[PDB]
Amino acid sequence: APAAVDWRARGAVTAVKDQGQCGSCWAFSAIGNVECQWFLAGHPLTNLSEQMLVSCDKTDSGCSGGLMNNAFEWIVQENNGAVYTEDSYPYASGEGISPPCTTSGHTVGATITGHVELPQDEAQIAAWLAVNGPVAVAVDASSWMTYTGGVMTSCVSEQLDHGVLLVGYNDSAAVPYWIIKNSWTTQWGEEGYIRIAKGSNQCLVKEEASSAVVG
Ligand SMILES: *[C@@H](N)CNC(=O)[C@H](Cc1ccccc1)NC(=O)c1ccccc1
């Protein structure tokens, strides 16, 4: 694997979004992954719908929580692999209110055929990310409220509570780090992003890493 990767520089990552006052990070993580994978598949970078998952995906629990794996599963097995555009199915749960599911007239932004899980190994995850793009991961963001910038090194790593997106790493730095996309606006952290120490399983980052498959 390369010494450093940043898929943002490859224009493969969309703008930082805002989940608002809603427990829908799982949806943002999954959808982000699908966005990046769709671009890297040879298609235009399209903003996709988190609201599709929050409202329609009943395997998960809307604004109270859910799982990225469950989202990919639901997309393939229930929604024929379709991921709608954010433009034709916009996010509306910003204040905590989830509209009902609508299945007439929406526009398919991406089409996935499956998903893969990555080993609980930062090296193997990086090895994947360097080739096939950004990875949906679960973390312990309990100590993230106070993050303002820099490489976090003593992140509270107890129990998973947040869904974020690995978009790259840097093994060349004095302290090697993961570059992580969050869904807490651009005011938080490093322009919406956060760098965490790589190799010491910070925030339990290596626990649940998955990626969609765009056949
Ligand atoms: C983010 N603000 C919403 N939080 C959750 O959805 C929360 C944490 C989470 C971790 C990994 C992947 C997705 C979400 N959900 C859970 O703790 C959880 C666990 C088991 C079943 C449902 C929800």
Author numbering: 1 to 215
From the paper:
Chagas disease is caused by the protozoan parasite Trypanosoma cruzi, which is transmitted by blood-sucking reduviid bugs of the subfamily Triatominae. The cysteine protease cruzain is considered to be an attractive target for therapeutic intervention in the treatment of Chagas disease and the vinyl sulfone K777 (1) has been developed as an irreversible inhibitor of this enzyme. The human enzymes most closely related to cruzain are the cathepsins, in particular cathepsin L, and these have been targeted using the nitrile ‘warhead’ to form a covalent bond with the catalytic cysteine in a reversible manner.
The dipeptidyl nitrile scaffold, as exemplified by 5, was adopted for this study since it is an established starting point for synthesis of Papain-like cysteine protease inhibitors and the P2 and P3 substituents can be varied easily using readily available synthetic building blocks.
